[PDB]
Amino acid sequence: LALSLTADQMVSALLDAEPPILYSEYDPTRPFSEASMMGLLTNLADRELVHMINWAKRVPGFVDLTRHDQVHLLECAWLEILMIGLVWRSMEHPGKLLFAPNLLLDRNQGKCVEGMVEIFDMLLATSSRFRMMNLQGEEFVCLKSIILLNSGVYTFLSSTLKSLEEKDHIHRVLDKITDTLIHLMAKAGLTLQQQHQRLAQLLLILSHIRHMSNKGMEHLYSMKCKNVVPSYDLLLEMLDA
Amino acid sequence: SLALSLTADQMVSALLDAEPPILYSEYDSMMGLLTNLADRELVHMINWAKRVPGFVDLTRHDQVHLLECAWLEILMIGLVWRSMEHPGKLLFAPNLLLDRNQGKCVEGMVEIFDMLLATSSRFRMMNLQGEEFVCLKSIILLNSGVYTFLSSTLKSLEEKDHIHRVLDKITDTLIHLMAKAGLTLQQQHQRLAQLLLILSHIRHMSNKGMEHLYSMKCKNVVPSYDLLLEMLDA
Ligand SMILES: Oc1ccc(-c2nn(Cc3ccccc3)c3c(C(F)(F)F)cccc23)c(O)c1
């Protein structure tokens, strides 16, 4: 079971579970309009969702949960997960966001609402921060898994002993991933003080990622397209192998 | 910088000393009550903020931005802390204690109500301490708005460095409190993580709250940049 993994075993499992990088729809009309870019981003996200499920199922401890809880975590976290992926990819492209290898955008290219440019600006900042911190791949997979387990946990609520067990199991897996992060940092040769400071610096960034997702989710719901937001039923369907 | 020299004990002492008082609701409609209470709390929050070590080292403009971004999170975490010992209830004030069902009469707040309850219950199961609480609140103040400063000028860059250094000092403080309490090294890193991860959820609740204010046509109750600037300048 997941709770028995060593730090080295957890890292290996997470790295192996990594999803592929997808391309955006090839050769779209350029310049973009507000709708056309959204069409590209939405299509891309839709295609990544499938791979995210595959990834999620390989996150140690995820499948120990009921299907309902597995769906609830994905519901709450999908955009955060996509965004941290985006920020990781964009690290060595200052001033730009690498949504896909064939879709590298600066803050002016894509046509966007001014609410969108704020989010874009926030994504860029986060990416620079990771660049500055010299974030490592092994740390990234830990953070992405933390987002998956953490984002929807406080809203299980609640009662039943089983509901409590589920929450308890999530927190224990979270603890193991924390252990893993620290193990990586110590292994790298950071002092105890630097280890504890870096951990905190990384986790605090997650709150910003939650903010960006909240803002993005907000915009998504204001689109009279009745969908790019995956439903509970859709996510559940996708979960059944 | 003065802040950068503080020990863990001094940091805690300063923070405990800066705590605002717990205010009473004057009239014990939900929007009417939150508004009356929040308006009076804001005044105390500004003065609490100016007492957080490192905060007044920032430009007046940067202080306003931090508060602008953090204000609802700070109100909300105060509420969660106050409600900690009241399972199933939110203690908006000593004379305003609400359960989930009175939280239904209040329209689209039921979900936010539930999230708040869930956070308070998390605090309860963690045995969150007053000393840890004041650290968390300070972290929210310095962290929520730091990524949207605008960089550019040398000053804004120097401002961000300073914020990050103070945050590191608060991390040190938290760890010290835990070691002092007898936690093993492992338990210290774990609890640190658990505490900080709750902040993602507080941000989430603040965002839903804002979302709800706008849909309620209550955009007006939000402290504006200029309002905050004038309160600080006092
Ligand atoms: O791998 C991926 C795939 C898609 C996204 C992505 N980010 N944003 C926010 C955003 C995107 C562009 C410009 C401004 C904000 C999105 C929005 C949106 F509606 F939230 F914007 C809608 C659909 C997808 C995205 C991503 O971050 C990573």
Ligand SMILES: Oc1ccc(-c2nn(Cc3ccccc3)c3c(C(F)(F)F)cccc23)c(O)c1
């Ligand atoms: O000590 C406290 C603790 C909580 C609140 C608070 N304000 N708001 C929005 C709000 C309403 C009116 C005026 C200002 C803010 C809240 C909402 C929300 F869903 F309504 F946002 C939901 C739950 C709590 C609050 C508070 O104001 C003070």
